[model samples]
Target: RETLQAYDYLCRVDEAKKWIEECLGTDLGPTSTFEQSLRNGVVLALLVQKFQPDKLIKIFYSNELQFRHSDNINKFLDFIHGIGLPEIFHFELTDIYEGKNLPKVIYCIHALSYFLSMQDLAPPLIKSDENLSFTDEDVSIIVRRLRQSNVILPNFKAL
Candidate 1:
C-alpha cells in the first residue's frame, strides 16, 4: 500500500517541483509529472540510508535479469536510442528488486550519471560511498529513473 500511495502522491504531487528546482539550482523537467518520483525516491533513499546511510546505493535496477529474446532486446535498444535523458530514464520498484545485490549498485550510479550527465551533471560525483546520502539531490533523480522504467519491463518479461 505504501508503494501505491507513494505513486499516487508522486503522480499528483505538485509542490515537490520546488524542491527539485531548489536542488538543481535550475529549472528541470515538467515538475508536475516528475514530482511523485522525486518523493517516492526520497522516501526510499531515506529508508535505505537508515541502515547504511552512506552506502553508494541500495535497490538495484531490476534490469539485471536477461531479456528473453533478441527481438525484445532490439526493441529495448530502440527505446533506449530514443530516450531523452531526465525525461524517460526513471526506474520504479521493479527496477530495484530487493535481495538482488550490493556492488551491482554501480549500475544505478551509472544510469543516474548518464541521465544527469545529459544535463551537464557528471556521474562520478555520486559514484562513491561518500556520495550516497538519501537526501542528496540525486535521490530525487533516482526516483525519476525508477518511475520511467515501466516502459521496458514487457520486453524482458517473456524470458
Candidate 2:
C-alpha cells in the first residue's frame, strides 16, 4: 500500500511539474528519485505550514535561517520565500550547468530543468546530419540530457 502511493506520485510525471510550480509559487521547469524527493519536499513544506506555523513565523520574523531543515525541504522553502542562497551553498556545480554560486535550491531547479527538456528518443549517434531528424541545437540538447541522466541512472547510455 505504501509502495503504491509512492509509485502514484512518481508516475505523475505530467502533474509533477505543475504541482511543484504551485508549491514554489513560480514556474521552474519540467523535471525529478529526485522526483520522489520533490514530492516529499513539497509535502514536508505543507506539513510545516499547517502544523508548525510558528516555525514559519519565526523564519519570517528573523533574518537568520533558523530551524535548519533538510536540503530538499530548505530548497522548497527558499523558493517559496524568494530567498537567495547564501555563501555556503553558492558554488559552481557541473561545468555544463554553471551555478555561479546560486543557492542550492536554484541549483537543483537548474539541474531538473535539463531532465524536463530531455528527448524521449535517443538521437542516432552514427547517423549523418542529413539523415538525422534533429537540428544541430536539438541534437546538442538531447545529447546533453542523455549524459546528465546517465550520471544519475546507469545504463541510460545503453538505452
Candidate 3:
C-alpha cells in the first residue's frame, strides 16, 4: 500500500486526474504491486476528505492563522499551505502531464519550478507566476484550526 501510494503521489496520477475517452489509453501492461500502494494512499486521502473536512485554506485563513481545535488536521493543512504557497513566494500549482512527483514535495516542486521558471521548457508551472501574500491573520487561522481539531499541544495559546 505504501509503495503504490507513494508512487501514485510521485506519479501525480491520482484519481483526480483521470478521464474518459480522450484521457483513456489502454493499459498496455500488467498491474504491478506498485499500484496497490497508490490505491491505498488514495483511499487514505479520501478518508481525510470525507471524515475530516478541515476548513478551507482561503476562507479559513483569509484574515489570519489561528491554532484551531483540530490541531492535527490544521497542522497538516498548515504544512501544505505553508510549503505550497509561502509568503516569500507567489505562485499556485497546476500539474503538468510531465512531472514525476507533484506539488507535494518541496524539493521536487522547487526543482521543477526552477527549470520551468527559466526556460519554459514546458509550460510554466503555476508556482512560476504566483505572487502571493499571506497576512499574519493567515497564520492565526492555522493555529485556530489546529486547536479546533485538538492536535495542538495543551499549553498552546490556541486553547
Candidate 4:
C-alpha cells in the first residue's frame, strides 16, 4: 500500500524530469519517452533504496515470482535495464536463492550497489552493518564515494 502510493507520487512529481536532467547532465531530447521512464525508474530506485524498502518487498510478495521468467515486474525491469542495471534483470534469483527466497528489495539494493561500484562510487543507501552479502571494504568504498559525490542519505543509520 505504501509502496504503491509512493510510486504514484513519483509518477506525478514533475520535478523528476528536471532532477534527472541535472544529475545526468544531459538533455532528454525533447520528450524521449523511454529515456524519461528510465530516468524515473532510476529516481524511484534511489528513493526506494533509501526509504520504504518494506514497500518494495510488500509489492513483490503479493505478486507471483517466476525466476528467469516474466512477471508483473517485467516492465519495471525494463526501466532498470534502460537505466544501465540490466545485470539485475538478467540474473536468476533462483540460482542465488537459498532455502528461502529473499525480497526483491534486497536485490534492488544489491543491484544499485553494484551499479554504483561500477562507477567507483559507494553504495549510498547500503549500510555496512546491515548488508549481509557485501564486505565491509565494499561498503566503505561506497560511503567514501557517496561522500565525494555529496550524496547524503536521510537518517543515514549504519544498521
Best by lDDT: 4
lDDT of 1 at 85: 36
Q: What lDDT score is found at residue 138 in candidate 3? A: 40
Expressed as tens digits, the lDDT of each residue in 1-159 for candidate 3 is: 333323323222222122111122323121122222222133222322332357433212222555232332333334435435453322122211111222222233233334433664333333211332334444354334344542211111111
Query: What TM-score, to 2 decimals, does candidate 2 have?
Result: 0.25
Question: Looking at candidate 4, what is the lDDT of residue 24?
Answer: 48
lDDT of 2 at 66: 46
Pick out the ten consecutive residues of candidate 1 with the lowest summed lDDT. Answer: 150-159
Q: What is the C-alpha lDDT of each candidate?
A: 0.34, 0.35, 0.29, 0.35
Q: Better model by TM-score, 2 or 3? A: 2
**Per-residue lDDT of model 4, residues 1-159, tens digit only:** 433332222222223334334444555442213222332234333333333335452122223553322232343444456566656333332422320222233334345444555675542332223222333444454344344543222211221
What's the CA error at residue 139 for candidate 3, in Å? Answer: 1.4
The number of clashing residue pairs in each candidate reads: 11, 2, 44, 2
For candidate 1, what is the lDDT? 0.34
Better of 1 and 4 by TM-score: 4
Name the 10 consecutive residues with the lowest summed lDDT in model 4: 95-104
C-alpha lDDT of candidate 2 relative to the true structure: 0.35
lDDT of 1 by residue, 1-159 (tens): 334333333322222333334434455465334433332244234323333445544332235674323222232223333444342333333333331221122233234444544666332232113321233234465455546544321111111
Task: List candidate 2 stretches off by more than 4 Å.
Answer: 1-14, 29-52, 57-142, 148-159
